[PDB]
Amino acid sequence: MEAGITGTWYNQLGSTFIVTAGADGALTGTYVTARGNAESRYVLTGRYDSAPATDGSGTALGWTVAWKNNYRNAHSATTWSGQYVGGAEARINTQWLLTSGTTEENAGYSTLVGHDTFTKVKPS
Amino acid sequence: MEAGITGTWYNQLGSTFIVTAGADGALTGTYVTARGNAESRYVLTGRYDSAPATDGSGTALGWTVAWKNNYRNAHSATTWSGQYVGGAEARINTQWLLTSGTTEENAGYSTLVGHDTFTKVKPS
Amino acid sequence: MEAGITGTWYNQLGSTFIVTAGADGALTGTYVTARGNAESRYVLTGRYDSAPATDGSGTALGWTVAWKNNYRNAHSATTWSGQYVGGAEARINTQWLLTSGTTEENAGYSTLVGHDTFTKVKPS
Amino acid sequence: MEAGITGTWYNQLGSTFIVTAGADGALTGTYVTARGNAESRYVLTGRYDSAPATDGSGTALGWTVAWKNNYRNAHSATTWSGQYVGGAEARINTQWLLTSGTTEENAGYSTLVGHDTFTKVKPS
Ligand SMILES: [Cl-]
Ligand SMILES: [Cl-]
Ligand SMILES: [Cl-]
Ligand SMILES: [Cl-]
Ligand SMILES: [Cl-]
Ligand SMILES: [Cl-]
Ligand SMILES: [Cl-]
Ligand SMILES: [Cl-]
Ligand SMILES: [Cl-]
Ligand SMILES: [Cl-]
Ligand SMILES: [Cl-]
Ligand SMILES: [Cl-]
Ligand SMILES: [Cl-]
Ligand SMILES: [Cl-]
Ligand SMILES: [Cl-]
Ligand SMILES: [Cl-]
Ligand SMILES: [Cl-]
Ligand SMILES: [Cl-]
Ligand SMILES: [Cl-]
Ligand SMILES: [Cl-]
Ligand SMILES: [Cl-]
Ligand SMILES: [Cl-]
Ligand SMILES: [Cl-]
Ligand SMILES: [Cl-]
Ligand SMILES: [Cl-]
Ligand SMILES: [Cl-]
Ligand SMILES: [Cl-]
Ligand SMILES: [Cl-]
């Protein structure tokens, strides 16, 4: 269990996610891209690794969004890998990989990499 | 639905996973590290993006394993991002990020990157 | 030629580099880690791709530091890949890979990934 | 000095590079893409970290190619980060980042990630 993960998080570019952390390591919820209607909402699922933190170490986690809903099918999926830190400056610091379905010929250029910082309050 | 994903896949280093692809984009199953007893089995969850493939393009997907079970708590989690290609040379080509829980001071060095190729038959 | 690259840049964690951009795409200079004496100075070399910017697009570049000098031999090297943007909010936004020399057995865990933002003035 | 690095290396997809390892950590040479005429040749520069190998550990290195020559200007640059291992199965195992110059709006999707294995003899 890591109750501090459960809730709404915002990246610095206008996306949102609402996650529930389950007692035995499940992450489930919804990822909302910058626009922010039903057209913009996607299922997310992942896992987190709770431990008896010894040195206010972060909590490791990851999740996936496949970019398909009732309004869009981007032929793509993103995974985020990172850690949650609680407290007054609570954050989920992540790196992400975005893979698109490609032909074999273009498979070398299938995967973008980047980073996201999620906070409990919106940027700007 | 992408029925060809469902089943057992092997990386080139001795790990296994058994996944079920659900009809509306869910991935669920178990990841087994090289040793291969109950000590070595972990929950995995992820998502895939099925589409009406136009040019035998791959199917985008991702999943997460938190490295905690009844026998180990590695304070870590890995995400795989990649694509499934079916047929005679079926494969899931992936890149992965492995994040460990760290102190703030060591947060810069929290995340390893690499790659895995999964096939329907074992290597060697 | 991209004269705006030439000079001193600071990351948000206390490192510095002083680079010269050569007329035909060379980057040469010195990278200084957080402490900031001779013990902390390393050779850097890389390349940049100048073009007749059409839409204030960034300038692609990359460089390498091998973490060996007269005072340290970390058995490691980092590459930065990113783009330079000039003007009032000048920056070099980068992602980096840090590889350590390993045994074959540990080769899978050889490479860390992260990100750095460089600015013309120091953080904080 | 690491004399075993100096020479010609081939990736598994038809590219070539010819590198010279200098005595004090310099890498210099030429990268040739799959086609393989003057149109396909680019300057490379990087660094390697030589050390008194204790356990046949690899040698850490990195290099950059800006994708501009007299025939092409791709507004891009790739960095490779990896390690050299000598002997009967000599190889340079790498991960790479490819960044394109973008607008600010598209900066999030500027950087592709992948992997290359270089050997002394051609694939296939
Ligand atoms: Cl986002
Ligand atoms: Cl749970
Ligand atoms: Cl959307
Ligand atoms: Cl929907
Ligand atoms: Cl494609
Ligand atoms: Cl962000
Ligand atoms: Cl970030
Ligand atoms: Cl594995
Ligand atoms: Cl489903
Ligand atoms: Cl294990
Ligand atoms: Cl278990
Ligand atoms: Cl730590
Ligand atoms: Cl593999
Ligand atoms: Cl692979
Ligand atoms: Cl640094
Ligand atoms: Cl030059
Ligand atoms: Cl240092
Ligand atoms: Cl020195
Ligand atoms: Cl090692
Ligand atoms: Cl930074
Ligand atoms: Cl950054
Ligand atoms: Cl190549
Ligand atoms: Cl040299
Ligand atoms: Cl070319
Ligand atoms: Cl040329
Ligand atoms: Cl662009
Ligand atoms: Cl390759
Ligand atoms: Cl490879």
Numbering used by the authors:
A (entry chain A), B (entry chain A), C (entry chain A), D (entry chain A): 1 to 124
What does the paper say about this structure?
The long-wavelength beamline I23 at Diamond Light Source overcomes these limitations and extends the accessible wavelength range to λ = 5.9 Å. In this study, we report the determination of diverse protein structures by experimental phasing techniques carried out at long wavelengths on beamline I23 at Diamond Light Source using S, Ca, K, Cl, V, I, Cd, and P as anomalous scatterers. Native-SAD uses light atoms naturally occurring in proteins or bound to proteins. We demonstrate that long-wavelength native-SAD has become a very compelling technique, where a low multiplicity dataset from a single crystal can be sufficient for successful structure determination, making it a general vehicle of choice for experimental phasing.
A second example of a protein without any sulfur atoms is the streptavidin mutant Streptactin XT28. Data were collected at λ = 2.75 Å from crystals that diffracted to better than 1.8 Å resolution. The structure could easily be solved with seven chloride ions bound to the protein although the data was not collected at the chlorine absorption edge (Cl K-edge = 4.39 Å). To the best of our knowledge, this is the first example of Cl-SAD.
